[PDB]
Amino acid sequence: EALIRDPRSPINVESLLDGLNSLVLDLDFPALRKNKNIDNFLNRYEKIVKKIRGLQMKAEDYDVVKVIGRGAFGEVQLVRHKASQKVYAMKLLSKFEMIKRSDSAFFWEERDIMAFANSPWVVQLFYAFQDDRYLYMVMEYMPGGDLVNLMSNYDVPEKWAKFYTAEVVLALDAIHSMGLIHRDVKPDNMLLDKHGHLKLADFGTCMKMDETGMVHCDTAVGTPDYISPEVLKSQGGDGFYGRECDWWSVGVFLYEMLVGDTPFYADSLVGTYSKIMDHKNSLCFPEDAEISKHAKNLICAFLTDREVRLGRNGVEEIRQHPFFKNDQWHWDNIRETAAPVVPELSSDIDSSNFDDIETFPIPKAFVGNQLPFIGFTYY
Template structure:
């Protein structure tokens, strides 16, 4: 407990609700401090400011009550050490030191702790003097209370002698709870009346975040997410671009094939031209009419292939600027679409911001109203206490008058 409270103070926070109900046991029997709903951040001077009584009445410290009374509301982490002393007293004696039937009487005993705090005289309680001294050092005025120097004050106390503070979590706990799994709650008493439907209104649905993809956080594929794929290429544009690439590749392949055929035809034409040579008698042999016809056919085919090759090259040159223009148009369209989507998202964010500001104003108004009601309640409480004191004094006077009259009646008789 000392280490747990000290760790909170080291983080510059004060717990303000230390009690046995807020201490849990883990599977190994070591404690876990819980319920940080009343925590406050310490200021630079090591104090917090609050004029509201927080915590459980039996464990609340006198400085918190005093801060509520005078309205200044400043105290420090010493209030947690007071509550620790009350917890220790309860664990050793079975009840809190300032228990009373009414809340007013309990607070009165706490404020008058110098006269009201004492140990039971029952000999059945065997409590060492060191333990009593530790409780006296915790349940006392804040200026004399143990813990002003942190846990070092406890390490130097006689009740913690020979305790291995650094290896305390490695030691065997005196009690180890029986649990079947890390989620076993069989040791908790659950009241059916505590299980009720929450009145909280569900948050406003946001189309940009549906939480459907949360199980896949960490994976890189996010196709279809309007938050991460605003600039991605649509599937129809991707398929169109792929078709154009395949068309260009086919044209280039056709061009290469025609160039190859043209080269072969030229080589064949040269071979045909080589048929007109020189005879055995030295005279030149002219090509036959058949070979001449073949040469003309080859020449026509060469011309046709050359023309087709020029057409393919022209188509290829026209296709490339067209693709470039189409890509530029696509990029411009995507940019415009993304701008529109971003503007829509900005409008949604502005709307959410306005709603949040409205909720903030409503919460501030509600807080002011609650603060006013609290002040009125405190004023009524003070009036009730004054009336109670006045009635008590009046009752005492009436009793004295009654006793005086009774004596006078007896004297006359």
């Protein structure tokens, strides 16, 4: 009875309602309705279930203002909740696409992190809900935009890069202390709030660690420009690695902010993969770079193999690095100091810091396509 009230429980009221609602969806087809048992359930429950569908949070309760992000299986929408008039970013994930592409389980960690991290470094989730087509995650809007947009609009000086690198480190350290490795650290995932401070956002590739702090994985995951050698090398077989893969992707981020291009750019994915493999040779700063010895040192200390990578022993050895010497902020208070770019926002749906941007087949027998999504609804 404690778990029925526990928002972390798999058998709370919201998951029970998901169970009943998924069942009705997956049975209500005339073919399956020839079974009398199936029809005896559906006629008894159809009316109340459609009443429940209207009363629970649904997509029509939101006004879609503009699309501000896209991803493999859906989009992010800037929405206004009609009743409350509050403003949110709503992420949609396609159930058809996720089933078709056998990718229907990455979203639990994403949901739980944003729902429960309760951290200034993690975008908070207020509501998760679903309909027969989509999963929805209603998050706090990040009007600052992402670091892609920022780098597109400024020549980033080393004083700014110091700041964003420090905040990314504290954000990644925060996610580490929850037992997770991010595995897909990129400027597209680094968003800025009303005040210009960083939060992490796309936790689709995240994974919980061992008691050893390790993870077993055989799939290379993340983004090609930012993937570390150990994760890339794990596509073969029996990859065993720890959180220090996120520090590799901080180094790629530092290079990109200061140099203007990713360190292992290539005109093919296949080329990028090969450069990362050959990183001890392909990593090469342009001659006209004009980047400090301290910045080059930190970048190079991140863009190494895990055995000699800065951060392997913890974050303290990152924090004391001389590149982070500065007269603006400390590691203790950085988020309470002034950001390099404070966003000038004209409305609560000002979206000026974001660039502009098939159904299930009717079953013949019970397939259960709605079953992988039971328990996703939250609050």
